[PDB]
Symmetry: D2
Subunit: 346 residues, 4 copies
């Protein structure tokens, strides 16, 4: 026969199934309680029942777990300190999607050297998330595929579907069966309709393909996710100001979905310049003081150290998108806490 | 000890692995030969080694195998008759992605009644593709997820990644290991950079998660797909005309990827009107007559009977997007054949 | 770094999982009814609620399914005719365990030429069992390992654990979770304790290692099989006469298990002389006339044609142990039917 | 559709696949060398190329790994002390086969409380075996089924098939693909032919059903095991003396298999009284000092503290068959080393 199968495949390696990771790193009672509780709390924010600000804040991507747990220990103090004004949740993204050839994230390539030790990667990803939850810091992440969630979704209190996948039917179907609340980002060029469309789609029951905990191909029948919302992350032009929030909210009401939204201070809203995250946060603060009824959260890309680097030389310094440092982070959260205390008190 | 896992999952059900369907419906010598040959012949059009026009043509979605087989028998005659000018490959899409609630396609819901007998669907799909190839008709389809291809990619001569997934990293990774040439559509609002980037991305080696033929979770390390191209399919504005082809070509050369492209006569370029497909085809024909050096194919939604219908009452009429009928198909193909006969003789 | 794993293994090949066979050959409504009620009917014989005689009768091993179906259609007329006196179930054994190099049975080597096409054999075995049941003929078999049952046990009305495996803990555990009544044979040298112990063991809950329907290693927690009994099949000397029955009954009563047993007319009771099966059946008929309260069934090795052959040249003639032909079978059943008519009438 | 499938199954639970354990506890360089060499050294005894006595000695069953490690540390000193005369390998059996309801072993029930935590049991079993090998004590075990060996056979230098399974075709097939040398015991009533038949059978190639390292059902094709021998373990009467050895040797040569055998000092050769293990060993000693040409090994049930316990209330005390203590073990080994010194020196 002429060959027709796997013509462009170098290798297919079997993967340790989720149950193997679950046996080594079973979720503890206290992590279980933190996740259940934070999921519910976030849901209240999504549907306008509590007026705290959800703050998803942390590195662009995790490239070292030691630095991440160190970051978490500082953030934990602010989480407790601002607990009446803000619901702080740590951003634990293992990979930034990239068009150009480059590092594929911590799950994919934990040794940062192109050896793609994914079993170790997933094991590390789960270990980190259990430790964070065990210390009192809830975690959030981006789900890029339909398989990785079986390894650690049980430890995630909030999920994101990125700008590049919000329109994708299979990612919407995934979101409809995710145990956590989910935010959908507007398209890379500013299209908001696709995120509005996605919350619609994700609240309904769907079927997609994936694997069981034991690692076998299966059909997943989901119940719908009622806790979805939009994230404004800019486009050609930023979309974070009051007028864009207003238009967005009107559109969400017309589609019959939640008009409470998140604003990303990073990415195309900061123009890929980390020193502008603070500008976006200040405008949001202004919005919260005047009115700001439709804002329920913000996203901030933050690290121990500011900026970015191509190689992982410097500890707690991003190797993907540039972040603000810890000093600026304390400044940003004091401000948001300050502004939302006034909103909550009106 | 609060629950955190599969909170919004109604059911998970095991799927028959690929090997079960490969065991019952193994590829034949003839089907292997046709797939292999057709994939090569198409790559030749992609890289400009041959100036025949690839015509991806057939129903919007397959909802009846008998009608598809009948359609194929008619198309076969014209595939042979035009074989020196056109490379005709049947469209065999099992689903049409959509945002609203509705029929999820032949793989997901073969009984067209909401039972989701996916084991049956996947079986019928492979059976139809094996039959089409055995009769002399090569097939093409859209790959919407990372698992379904293990079940029938071996029977597919050309693959599409739709507008909604072209920017998705995991779909680009998938394309990088598909055995067939792959077309990337421009975004739903007419964005071409995502498809140009996708070609660049898919030519490189990647890892993604999927399942082995035996249905177990796995790491797939791909080789890169050197045979990818863009498909112009409209957006806010149609992009089929000479001026758009030339803008696209310029952008492709500047990214250092192939400047040969496909034009979808349907969907947003026809504005969802099936009678405008013939208009787009004539415009393409006129370009091939004048120059048209960057056009390597077209896409046409065609069935035995023209139009569309909500319920599958009429034999051979679409229940998804509207199609041209057999009569206009004959004329479209005869038009494109003659226009390309001239381009070829230059 | 020395190799320590799989030193003496030539190949490990993956099987189609049971779900693959179950999907091609699902159990029909009618086959389900037959299996359900025959298991119940037999259970009534084991615990003494009904005085009909279970007759397990058919070839030593199946090597041709067509002969087995032709055998089955003749036997069916007799199953119907003697249904008030005899409960006739066909023997569908796929393999005779042996010590010397030879044919490994219809599952292991369905093509009978040493190519070990196990996927094909499991398929053929299931199809044969399905067709038998669909025609009205219940089936029985011997379970030699802990994995093959997942492929066809749903089609089996009565099971044997052979003389060579009755003492094996893992086989006793299997029996404890088999859906059918099970007969255990006495040891090759005549030891009855191992079968009495086996019945005891198998009535309890156990755990044993096996495979799920999807083919994954699993732990099976069984509930106990309350329907087990012994089979007197001879030893150094035959054990079929009234004295031996009576000694067995007492021992059975002493271990507090059912004192109804089965007598195998073949094997070491006939001493591998198929013409003696008739004399064993005549002894049993006499016991039934006189009393025989502890007999609930008999086993008989029977085919279309008598004797045995080394190669499968002659149609419907055994390639394992020698069987009685069809004419002698008619006599034997008539003999047993008439005798038990009088036992039942008392 | 009446139910016919799994009627008497309480629960099917997925088991961690072997690879999961092999990932947490990979074999080390040193353990590899110890396993590889010992297997070769045993092969040499089996085939008469060295006259050292193989000594399989250790607890009847392991129920505490701390005690097993302490026992091993003491045994190691003797292993080295007597290395020129004896090859001391540790008995590391996890379960003892039972007809009556009892503790089902360390693998099945590591917590000694009916929780059947088999994943943990298998993990513990592997861990113990890896530790033993790491400190320089090779290990030996009974293989009771066709799945457990995938989890630790790589750490085993000698395997036993017990009296209850020696006649079993599937265990013979298992043995034919085991990396270690294998001993087959004579039947529980003293039948030697089954063990002689077993060696014959196990030296040829076989197919049996099992699971891959990845935990999926598979067809195993073995190469044959050339290193099998019998074990004399008594029956209705003891079989350990010169005249039973002589007669066994004769039947062995006559069947064209190795006439070197092992004698079990325990079980039916001791009358199930641990105090008579020594009297058996004294007889073997006398045989060696006169001739003892056919003896290549002995088997001894020994522990730190002598005797049995109904429940595990004491350190280093058997909870299954009764074992001689350390004192009696020092004396037995001295006796054997001394007698065998004399055999080796002529
Ligand atoms: N386990 C995920 C949902 C999920 C289920 C099955 C899958 O295959 C994938 C994802 C959660 O609890 O959110
Ligand atoms: N088998 C596909 C490539 C592929 C391989 C593995 C997967 O999991 C998915 C897709 C092809 O030949 O095109
Ligand atoms: N399926 C078997 C019982 C069984 C279940 C699991 C196994 O792994 C083996 C046997 C029956 O219906 O009798
Ligand atoms: N792994 C075993 C042999 C074996 C192989 C496969 C199995 O499924 C079972 C046992 C050994 O090395 O001795
Ligand atoms: Mn980022
Ligand atoms: Mn369409
Ligand atoms: Mn027989
Ligand atoms: Mn013992």
């Amino acid at each position: 026969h002429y060959p027709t199968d796997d013509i462009k495949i170098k290798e297919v390696k079997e993967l340790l199934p989720p149950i193997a990771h679950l046996y080594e790193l079973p979720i503890s009672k206290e992590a279980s309680g933190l996740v259940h509780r934070t999921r519910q709390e976030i849901s209240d924010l999504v549907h306008g029942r509590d007026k705290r600000l959800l703050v998803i804040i942390g590195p662009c991507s995790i490239h070292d777990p030691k630095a991440a747990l160190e970051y978490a220990e500082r953030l934990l103090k602010l989480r407790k300190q601002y607990e009446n004004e803000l619901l702080i949740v740590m951003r634990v993204y293992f990979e930034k999607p990239r068009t150009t050839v480059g590092w594929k994230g911590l799950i994919n390539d934990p040794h940062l050297d192109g050896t793609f030790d994914i079993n170790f990667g997933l094991r590390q990803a789960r270990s980190l998330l259990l430790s964070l939850n065990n210390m009192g810091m809830p975690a959030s992440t981006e789900f890029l595929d339909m398989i990785t969630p079986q390894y650690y979704a049980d430890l995630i209190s909030w999920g994101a579907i990125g700008a590049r996948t919000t329109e994708s039917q299979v990612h919407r179907e995934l979101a409809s069966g995710l145990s956590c609340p989910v935010g959908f980002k507007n398209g890379t060029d500013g299209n908001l309709k696709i995120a509005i469309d996605a919350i619609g789609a994700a609240s309904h029951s769907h079927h997609f393909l994936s694997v069981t905990k034991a690692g076998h191909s299966a059909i997943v029948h989901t119940g719908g996710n009622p806790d979805c919302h939009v994230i404004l992350r800019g486009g050609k032009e930023p979309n974070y100001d009051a007028e864009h929030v207003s238009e967005a909210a009107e559109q969400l009401r017309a589609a019959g979905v939640t008009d409470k939204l998140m604003i990303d201070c990073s990415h195309a809203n900061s123009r890929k310049d980390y020193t502008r995250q603070m500008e976006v946060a200040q405008d949001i603060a202004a919005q919260l003081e005047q009115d700001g009824g439709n804002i329920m959260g913000v996203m901030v890309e933050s690290h121990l150290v500011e900026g970015r680097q191509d190689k992982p030389e410097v500890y707690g310094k991003s190797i993907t998108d540039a972040c603000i440092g810890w000093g600026a982070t304390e400044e940003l959260l004091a401000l948001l806490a300050g502004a939302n205390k006034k909103r909550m008190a009106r």
